[PDB]
Structure formats: C-alpha cells, structure tokens
Design a protein around this ligand. Structure first.
Ligand SMILES: CC(=O)N(C)c1ccccc1C(=O)O
Ligand SMILES: [Zn+2]
Ligand SMILES: [Zn+2]
Ligand SMILES: [Zn+2]
Length: 459
C-alpha cells in the first residue's frame, strides 16, 4: 500500500451543507467523478488526486492550504483563499482581489503556485478542511492525466497551457493557465470533533480568523503541520536536497568546534555539561575538560523548561563550569552557557511556516521548532564573530590579497602580520559563519566571554 486506494471510503458529513443530499457511502473514485474529473483506468503514475497522511508528510514542502468561501454554486462568486495569504474572487459570468472570470483567475493561480513552490518541491499538495465548494471549484483550474515531463526540462509537469498545448514544471510555466496533476488531502478525514477554528485554536494563537478564505487556508495547513510534526514526530523520513543543506550543516559543525574550543581556552572551565541530542559527540575531542552528556531530543512543541532539565535531583551542579546548548531550545538559558538557537523568523527555502509562531525547519529531516523568544537569552550576550587558530603558520600546496583583521586570532596576527594559510583559513571560516547565520542560526554566550583572553594562548 504505497498510494491511497480510490476505493477507500471518504466521510462526507463535512461536505453536506454545501452539497445537500450527498451520499453517506462515498469512495475517492466516486468523489473524483462528482468533482467533474475522469480517471479512465489509467496506470500512468497518477492513481488518485488524494494522498495518504504518510505521502503528505513526505511532501510537506508542497503543502498549500486551500479554502473556498461562497461570497453570495455557478450563480454566486467564490472567494478562493490560499495559505500564501492570497484571496482571489472568481465570478461565474490578507491580499484581497476584486471579482474576475475563471479564465483570468486560473492564470493567477498558476503564477502564484509556481513562484511559491519552484524552489521547494516538484508538486503541490492542496491541504483542505473540505466543505464542498473547494472540491467543486477544482474543475475550473485543474487538468489531470498521465504523469508527464516538462517541455523545457526533465522535471515532472505541474502545469498545462491551453494556448500552446504543452506541459511545464513550476520553473517553466510563465503564461500557463492550468494546474496539472495536483495532489490534495482532506484534514477533516483524520477524525476531528468540531469545526476548523476550534481545533486550530487548541494549539495556535498566532493565526486569527478575520472570516476570509485565506485565514481558513492558513489555519488548515497549520493544524495539519501540528498533527504531523508537533504531536507526531518522525525523524526517519528523509527530504531531498533543495539548497545549501550540506554547506549549512558543515558550517554548523565548524562554528561549534571553534566556539567551544575558544570558550574552553579563554575561561578554562573544569567541566562542560552538553545538553541536547542523545547522539552528540564531543565537538572538541582534544580538550582537557570533563565532558558530561545529558539527553534531550529536539523539542517540537514548546521550549524545554530549564527547571525540568536541571532539577528533580548527573553532575547535579550545572552551575559548575559551562553549559553547552547546541540546538537545545530552552525557555531561559543559565548565565554560564554557550548557545546555538535556530531563529524561526528567518526567510529561506529550508524554513517553512509552522504552528503557534514556530517554524518547520527541513534540512535532511523535518524539525518543528518552537517560536524564537529573545527573553530566553537575558543572562547571555550575542556571540561576536572571531576566528581562532593555534595551527602552525605554513601554506602547503585560489589566489591572495593580504588580510588585515582584528578578529583573526593567530600567532601571526599577534606577531603583526597574518600568514597566507591563516588568511585562507580565516576567509573560509568567515564564509561558513555567514552561511550559518543567514540560514537562521543565532549564537549566544556567557557575558564574561572575551576573545582578548585568547592572545595569551600564544606564549
Ligand atoms: C531539487 C530542487 O530544487 N527541488 C525543488 C526538487 C525537490 C524534489 C524533487 C524535484 C525537485 C526539482 O525541482 O528538481
Ligand atoms: Zn521545466
Ligand atoms: Zn496556526
Ligand atoms: Zn599564521
């Protein structure tokens, strides 16, 4: 069972206000037919427009909440809302657009999905809290058929053009008018009691309800993210490489080693309490320090309370030496800390909008991260950029312009002139650091941290 059987039952109770008289006994096969689409017994990679929760989780980057609200059923205008915040009014003749016929509305739908999704996914998953009008409006902007490739590249087709009779992916679809072979999922099939607003507001206070279709579309995708990534966590699902994943992760390991090594050299802590990932390894294996590990999986709901991590009776004395919290999200860090905290507000192709201010960070695996909170860092300060190295000054084996920097902490810079090797190493470390920061990671340290204490390690 890889795909969702068209003969699976679909509960129609949520559809009966917009569709009175709808049969209680309904399959996906019959629903797709009621929506005006013919599947023709096609074994060509598109077995059903609807997908399983497991297939939806694997394709979370394609999620687009979609809701349709009647403004006044072929006679009345419809308000089409998307989790991008867009509201389009389609006439059958927070961005609110005036009423227009379907022939122009569909062009706008293709442009919007193509721009939102081209750098995220190879498809679209319409995330619904289905009541009827959204399912019956699909025939006005969606075409289905066999799986196809783009006319201009090797990617799968996501759009169709009636003007040219061709197919395109999200990257080559300018001027295309139809969404081709989209996927969709109805959250209301997961067994909920009560309406969308009541279930969404149980877990989220960041998204409100003005009463427009995009507010519902946003709430729908948020509730789906809460169910699939907050209350249920799956770190075994792998996600494709769409950007700088490898470089960011490599940069994070470089910055961690640099920052921890320098903290140990500058303040000579006898003990380090490493709180976080139970699979963590010593980031400074040669350091003299007593390294003690404490297990805490990435929190996906609320940040950990420091009282629960440290108290209830371990070294017991977390106040001795230094605490290292590398992506271990806590409510209030102790003063003796070295911290890497992902800033959920960051705009990138890796970071998707999440639940209750949190974000869904997708890099190899999916990690719902609780909302960034500046008050967690009141006992610390922002860690300044610096490069430290005790390695010999020797080139071995790309061109050169002399480096002058007060933040290149090396024997050669103490001696008045940065050597070529430390200049190359400094520029590469500065690049890794900038990549990490721009990806969304923030670095914080104990107030007494001073890089001036690193110069005396060259005696
Ligand atoms: C690699 C990349 O940038 N993206 C968005 C993709 C991700 C999964 C499948 C296909 C694609 C594609 O568009 O090729
Ligand atoms: Zn293409
Ligand atoms: Zn929400
Ligand atoms: Zn040097």
């Amino acid at each position: 069972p890889t795909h969702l059987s068209v003969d699976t039952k679909f509960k129609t109770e949520g559809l009966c206000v917009d569709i009175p008289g709808i049969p209680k006994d309904m399959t996906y096969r019959r629903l797709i037919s009621m929506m005006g689409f013919k599947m023709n017994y096609q074994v060509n990679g598109y077995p059903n427009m609807f997908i399983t929760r497991e297939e939806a989780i694997r394709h979370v980057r394609a999620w687009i909440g979609f809701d349709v609200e009647g403004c006044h059923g072929t006679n009345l205008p419809l308000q089409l809302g998307f989790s991008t915040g867009v509201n389009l009014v389609a006439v059958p003749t927070p961005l609110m657009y005036k009423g227009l016929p379907w022939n122009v509305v569909r062009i706008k739908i293709v442009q919007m999905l193509s721009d939102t999704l081209k750098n995220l996914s190879d498809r679209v998953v319409f995330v619904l809290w289905a009541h009827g009008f959204e399912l019956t409006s699909m025939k006005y902007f969606v075409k289905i058929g066999p799986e196809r490739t783009c006319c201009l590249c090797d990617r799968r087709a996501t759009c169709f053009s009636t003007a040219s009779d061709t197919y395109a992916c999200w990257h080559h679809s300018i001027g295309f008018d139809y969404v081709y072979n989209p996927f969709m999922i109805d959250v209301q099939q997961w067994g909920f009691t009560g309406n969308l607003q009541s279930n969404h507001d149980l877990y989220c206070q960041v998204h409100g309800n003005a009463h427009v279709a995009s507010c519902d579309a946003i709430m729908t995708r948020c509730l789906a993210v809460h169910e699939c990534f907050v209350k249920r966590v799956d770190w075994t699902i792998e996600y494709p490489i769409i950007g700088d994943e490898l470089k960011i992760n490599a940069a994070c390991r470089k910055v961690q080693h640099m920052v921890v090594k320098a903290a140990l050299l500058a303040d000579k802590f006898p003990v380090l309490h490493d709180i976080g990932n139970p699979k963590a390894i010593k980031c400074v294996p040669q350091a003299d320090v007593e390294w003690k590990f404490y297990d805490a999986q990435p929190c996906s709901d609320k940040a950990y309370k420091i009282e629960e991590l440290f108290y209830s009776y371990h070294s017991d004395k977390f106040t001795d030496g230094v605490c290292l919290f590398w992506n271990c999200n806590v409510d209030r860090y102790p003063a003796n800390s070295i911290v890497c905290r992902f800033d959920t507000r960051v705009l990138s192709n890796l970071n998707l909008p999440g639940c209750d201010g949190g974000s869904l960070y997708v890099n190899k695996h999916a990690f719902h991260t609780p909302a960034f909170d500046k008050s967690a860092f009141v006992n610390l300060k922002q860690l300044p950029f610096f490069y430290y190295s005790d390695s010999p000054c020797e080139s071995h084996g790309i061109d050169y312009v002399p480096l002058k920097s007060a933040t290149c902490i090396t024997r050669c810079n103490l001696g008045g002139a940065v050597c070529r090797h430390h200049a190359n190493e400094y520029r590469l470390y500065l690049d890794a650091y900038n990549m990490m920061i721009s990806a969304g990671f923030s670095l914080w340290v104990y107030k007494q941290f001073d890089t001036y204490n690193l110069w005396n390690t060259f005696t």
